[PDB]
Symmetry: C3
Subunit: 149 residues, 3 copies
């Protein structure tokens, strides 16, 4: 049984030109790219993305830093929602484990390179917000017999 998570490379990942390195980390585990799209995030879509934080004082600056090119992604794998969060590491890079994306690439929470869904419910919500259903592609990885038990 596989699931799908929403992963988004933030404008700092684009501008520091580490998009390929990020994708490679997920491909390395045999996670399948089910969707991928470059767009420019706008305040209106970011308000819906960060709806849980509506009204808080840090949201305006969060929206400013996120207004920029982003890579929208959907990856598929076993337990991929929780596993992708583990691979990203703590929100605060200084607290993130060595070997995680945020520990390896970043210094502060406000520039922490990547977003990933925190639950099944948020993955469904975020994939619907950032993608049309035709953009989610169904295909099977040829190495499936050596990735899955």
């Amino acid at each position: 049984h596989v699931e799908q998570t929403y992963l988004m490379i933030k404008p700092d990942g684009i501008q520091r030109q580490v998009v390929g390195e990020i994708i490679s980390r997920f491909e390395k585990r045999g996670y399948r790219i089910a969707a991928m799209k470059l767009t420019i995030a706008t305040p209106a879509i970011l308000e819906e993305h960060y709806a849980e934080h509506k009204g808080k004082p840090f949201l305006p600056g969060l929206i400013e830093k996120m207004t920029g090119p982003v890579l929208c992604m959907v990856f598929e794998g076993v337990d991929v929602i929780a596993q992708a969060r583990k691979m990203m590491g703590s929100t605060r890079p200084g607290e993130a484990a060595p070997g995680t994306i945020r520990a390896d690439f970043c210094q502060q929470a406000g520039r922490n390179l990547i977003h990933g869904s925190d639950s099944a419910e948020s993955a469904k919500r975020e994939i619907s917000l950032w993608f049309k259903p035709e953009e989610i592609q169904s295909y099977k990885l040829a190495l499936s017999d050596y990735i899955f038990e």
Copy 2:
């Protein structure tokens, strides 16, 4: 004092073509390749290899998954039996620490890329099972003065 451990790249490591990457992780610490052999594992030898698991429900599927090309290896280093196990990570890739082989490459325990000896006794037994003594090569690393205290 150094010791020797038995490490085996499983068929998923061969088929996903990450043999070199695996070897590089161990070379990176100054561990010495003492033996190396590509073979195709067969049920009879695998039954001896996994003798401790005799009777367990998962053994027949383990033997099936392991029937295939494997790279037999012996690496030498300080505390290398326990250290190689630490580098491999937990049996379940999803529980393994970021930066370990299983966390970085794998999803499920049944396809977790690599075997390593779990103790001094099992290392001795496994090395003798898969290698004849004439296959074990003794030489000194040129950088020994900078690897060992």
Copy 3:
């Protein structure tokens, strides 16, 4: 709010020819190279560097291991003193976390590749010991807006 730490590649890092790999790990987080100098460490300066170990019985051997080429470095970043220590890993490579420098490259404490300042006071002392003020370079990283919140 950034600080500066003193990092030193030990003779084993020079001789194993992993200087560039070490530097890349720190550059990867957006840490700024503020100073860099190759020198051959002498017992006199090593005695002052390791003054906290004066009179102890392991000091003569530490100074001997360290008498050789070293790369003196100053890196700048948020919390970089503690963070560089985290990236280096425990003194004993066998105890260091996977994904740290010492865990990924080394076997024994006496050959553990790199030194880093362990506190604000030690960083100030060590930078001043190994560098004149004229050797510390002030410039701004062009990616600062994408590194710092």
